[PDB]
Design an enzyme around this catalytic site. Structure first.
Site, PDB file in Angstrom:
ATOM      1  N   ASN A 147      -8.887  -0.444  -0.526  1.00 32.55           N
ATOM      2  CA  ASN A 147      -8.325  -0.539  -1.880  1.00 32.55           C
ATOM      3  C   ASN A 147      -9.377  -0.237  -2.942  1.00 32.55           C
ATOM      4  OD1 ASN A 147      -5.883  -1.408  -0.802  1.00 32.55           O
ATOM      5  ND2 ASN A 147      -6.581  -3.527  -0.807  1.00 32.55           N
ATOM      6  N   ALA A 160       1.759  -3.230   3.044  1.00 27.31           N
ATOM      7  CA  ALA A 160       1.945  -4.665   3.185  1.00 27.31           C
ATOM      8  C   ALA A 160       1.402  -5.460   2.003  1.00 27.31           C
ATOM      9  CB  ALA A 160       1.338  -5.172   4.506  1.00 27.31           C
ATOM     10  N   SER A 216       0.766  -1.269   0.000  1.00 22.38           N
ATOM     11  CA  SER A 216       0.000   0.000   0.000  1.00 22.38           C
ATOM     12  C   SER A 216       0.801   1.327   0.000  1.00 22.38           C
ATOM     13  CB  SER A 216      -1.002   0.026   1.160  1.00 22.38           C
ATOM     14  OG  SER A 216      -2.005  -0.952   0.949  1.00 22.38           O
ATOM     15  N   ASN A 220       5.963  -9.434   6.146  1.00 15.82           N
ATOM     16  CA  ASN A 220       4.915  -8.514   6.623  1.00 15.82           C
ATOM     17  C   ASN A 220       4.856  -8.542   8.158  1.00 15.82           C
ATOM     18  OD1 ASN A 220       2.657  -6.990   7.104  1.00 15.82           O
ATOM     19  ND2 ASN A 220       1.209  -8.579   6.400  1.00 15.82           N
TER      20      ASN A 220
END
Ligand code: 0N4
Length: 351
Positions: free
Chosen positions: A149, A308, A61, A333
């Site tokens: 998103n 991530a 992101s 992550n």
């Protein structure tokens, strides 16, 4: 490298890598404008390839910052306006819930509850139309933020329609090329595969999976060198020779909404500097106050973004008024608070 930087970076990142079992990491500190680089560990464990200054990592992101800047550039070109209804650029979006939902709402997660992810079942573009037409907002436009998103991804795809360019061509020609980010990619080319780190999830080597609006929401891959250059450009956008890009950078750091201590930019998120890290969850719905009109980029800011993918963990933070910033790229992550803790420890020491 000045010893202060060397020491603060190594003393922070080494224990972090140990505590979090991160296979490989790259860090850049921008100090008084200049970048200093650090690498650890492995891009590919099985093949014993080390992390280098040329290793590509999935930004996840943090890509939203590129999307926000490219949207900002399109606004500066006069191609779109954030006050424009979404339906102006997607006429087929005729369902009545879209009345009153603008590009601004999409860009800033304030449309009324668009979900974090486009559903995995959405394969085709007609599937995507169906999805947005059938989506029912939980909230009125501009009242609540839900990081999504499907919200900024759609903003990115629509922001490039007038140009007539694909999202990738527009990103490459309007952002990556002007800023000389020659090793930054939406789609990793075969020529760069040897540099493309594997991500590690539950000890398995993995790369990002294809998905709807991936490019726009979480699909960029970059090196620590290019990401240092991205930070320098966002620190000092008047340095930038392309007028609309300079403007777009500044638009992405305007303050559009406030929730608690944080301000929502286009992609970027901002807090007033100085801050304490304590101030800096699958779903987190938060009421927003509109900033009417948006505040121009504030120099005394902690401007940041976390990122991530299944296999990667990224973080970028900078403080314009100090000419100071950091990029942390890892192929695991690991928890956000740890990234922010480490980044604050480093910048606070050098500031
Ligand atoms: B951003 O990094 O905050 C987006 N987060 S996300 O939870 O929506 C997300 C996580 C992981 C992937 C992914 N796809 N294929 N591998 N990982 C996509 C989106």
């Amino acid at each position: 490298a000045p010893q202060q930087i060397n020491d603060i970076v190594h003393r922070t990142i080494t224990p972090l890598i140990e505590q979090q079992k991160i296979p490989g990491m790259a860090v850049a500190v921008i100090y008084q404008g200049k970048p200093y680089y650090f690498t650890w560990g492995y891009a590919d464990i099985a093949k014993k390839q080390p992390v280098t200054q040329q290793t590509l990592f999935e930004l996840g992101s943090v890509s939203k910052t590129f999307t926000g800047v490219l949207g900002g550039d399109a606004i500066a070109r006069g191609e779109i306006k954030l006050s424009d209804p979404t339906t102006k650029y997607w006429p087929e979006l005729t369902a009545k819930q879209w009345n009153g939902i603008t590009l601004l709402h999409l860009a800033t997660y304030t449309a009324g509850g668009l979900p974090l992810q486009v559903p995995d079942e959405v394969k085709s573009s007609s599937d995507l139309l169906r999805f947005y037409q059938n989506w029912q907002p939980a909230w009125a436009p501009g009242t609540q933020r839900l990081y999504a998103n499907s919200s900024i991804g759609l903003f990115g795809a629509l922001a490039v329609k007038p140009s007539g360019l694909s999202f990738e061509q527009a990103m490459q020609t309007r952002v990556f090329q002007p800023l000389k980010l020659n090793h930054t990619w939406i789609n990793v080319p075969p020529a760069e595969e040897k540099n493309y780190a594997w991500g590690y999830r539950e000890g398995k080597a993995v790369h990002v999976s294809p998905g709807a609006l991936d490019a726009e929401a979480y699909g960029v891959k970059s090196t620590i060198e290019d990401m240092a250059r991205w930070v320098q450009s966002n620190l000092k956008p008047l340095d930038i020779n392309e007028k609309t890009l300079q403007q777009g950078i500044q638009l992405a750091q305007s303050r559009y909404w406030q929730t608690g201590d944080m301000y929502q930019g286009l992609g970027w998120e901002m807090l007033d500097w100085p801050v304490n890290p304590d101030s800096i969850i699958a779903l987190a719905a938060r009421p927003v106050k509109a900033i009417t009109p948006p505040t121009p980029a504030v120099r005394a800011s902690w401007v940041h973004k976390t990122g991530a993918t299944g296999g990667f963990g990224s973080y970028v933070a900078f403080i314009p008024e100090k000419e100071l910033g950091i990029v942390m790229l890892a192929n695991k992550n690991y928890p956000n608070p740890a990234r922010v803790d480490a980044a604050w420890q480093i910048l606070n020491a050098l500031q």
